[PDB]
Ligand SMILES: [Zn+2]
């Protein structure tokens with residue numbers, strides 16, 4: 044009746060962005076004596092959502108904390124608390140709430156739990172545990188065994204410990220977890236294979252990677268192998284063939300290097316070097332990654348999209364301006 | 367209906383019945399519930415207790431309601447009631463200006479824009495000229511060239527610096543077969559907008575052909591290259607050099623401009639010469655692969671970009687689809703525009 048109208052009117056002001064008005068309406072309702080207990084819970088819930096929209100997370104937390112012990116509100120209350128603790132980077136608290144949601148039991152929240160443990164592990168990778176970091180990552184793996192991020196971070200910790208064999212095992216898990224993130228592991232894997240004395244196998248790994256269209260990284264990397272091994276002629280032939288098959292400005296830029304280093308010298312090179320330099324500056328200015336959810340582009344890999352707040356949606360950009 | 371009345375009731379106890387109706391109508395408009403917004407604001411207008419100032423606010427809100435609904439003529443009837451009120455005049459005129467453009471009522475758009483200019487909105491001079499161009503475009507459909515030209519001249523009087531007016535005058539002069547006059551008009555773009563010179567090159571090429579003044583044409587391209595207007599003039603001038611001074615002399619010019627203003631298009635042109643001479647080997651391999659890739663990159667890259675909002679396109683728009691600004695979309699520079 045009147046109570047639902049009050050609740051709704053408050054909601055309308057919230058979605059309009061007039062959160063102060065929403066707060067006033069819902070708080071006055073929450074504090075009214077005419078309300079039933081159930082109606083009051085509804086008021087507390089909406090007031091909680093008002094505080095969320097306002098960025099008043101301590102206040103929001105107080106509201107939702109009052110609903111976790113209510114069957115009709117428990118699910119939403121934990122869900123909102125989960126959002127709060129992420130927004131405030133209270134990862135341990137986010138885990139605990141996500142745990143309750145999982146034991147209630149929300150399925151997909153295992154994904155976020157893994158990321159939360161990763162966030163915690165980062166705090167111990169800094170200050171260099173490193174045992175504490177690995178412990179957290181293992182808990183992360185337990186939560187989501189299909190998490191590419193966990194695999195990558197374990198690889199980095201293993202490499203820090205000089206455990207290159209174990210690093211390869213973790214890093215190559217990415218192949219079956221998220222193909223689009225394999226390119227993020229190539230630099231680390233290259234170092235690992237060198238430490239393991241398996242440079243030959245690495246060259247084959249890359250050969251198969253290019254065949255699976257891993258992109259410019261795996262191509263340029265294998266080109267440097269062809270060069271040091273079979274000379275600059277064999278490398279230029281390779282890049283030439285690949286450039287036709289997978290046109291990219293990065294491979295383009297490399298092929299110009301081969302020509303520029305072989306053909307000299309004079310006004311022909313002068314203008315050519317100017318162009319190749321232009322390509323280089325352009326490649327350097329372009330974004331490397333892009334959120335597949337909201338199209339937020341970036342320069343470095345974000346696991347948590349600063350825009351849409353989603354997890355593991357930002358992948359390397361493909362195409363001519365990508366890899 | 368009953369819900370709205372409930373909403374109005376609880377708002378009234380806090381802010382008064384007038385502000386309650388205004389606010390709630392506004393709230394529903396912003397939600398896309400414009401039918402609801404109109405009925406709320408209409409009900410407010412039925413009140414006998416409205417002060418004159420409050421009635422103006424209600425009129426303003428209904429105008430905005432009708433605009434949101436696309437009931438433009440009803441919106442106009444509202445805003446026209448506000449253009450003599452000091453606190454509402456500028457905003458009302460601007461709303462009307464937006465309406466008339468949305469409805470392609472160019473002459474009414476001109477009339478309100480001209481009043482805004484008088485009231486200090488100098489930026490509307492640019493738009494007035496465009497509106498006259500839109501009107502000119504109608505009398506060219508429709509080979510009514512004399513009226514089209516009359517309209518373009520009114521456009522020039524509003525904005526003597528309008529490049530679009532110069533280009534369209536060029537079109538009309540070319541339609542009349544008066545090619546010298548077309549040249550005089552089109553060449554004003556050199557001073558009116560450096561970045562739109564490239565848009566005149568094809569028309570000027572045609573004019574100079576009809577005039578048989580092939581020497582004055584190369585002279586203009588030199589002016590355009592000197593002003594750095596893009597790769598189009600460089601490529602056109604390159605063809606003139608090749609036919610006049612041979613392929614070698616052209617490759618040297620292009621290499622010069624490529625060292626000076628590097629672009630993919632000019633680079634592609636430079637590659638054509640090498641490929642046109644090179645024989646089988648690593649040349650026909652790497653050079654061909656490179657050339658064809660540049661060709662695809664050029665063939666795919668958009669040519670234009672709005673300098674205001676960043677919207678890109680493959681053809682020139684005078685009116686930006688994204689931000690609705692005029693004269694903001696220009697050719698993209700760098701590789702390979704410059
Ligand atoms: Zn995103």
Ligand SMILES: [Zn+2]
Nearest residue numbers: 672675686689
């Ligand atoms: Zn725009």
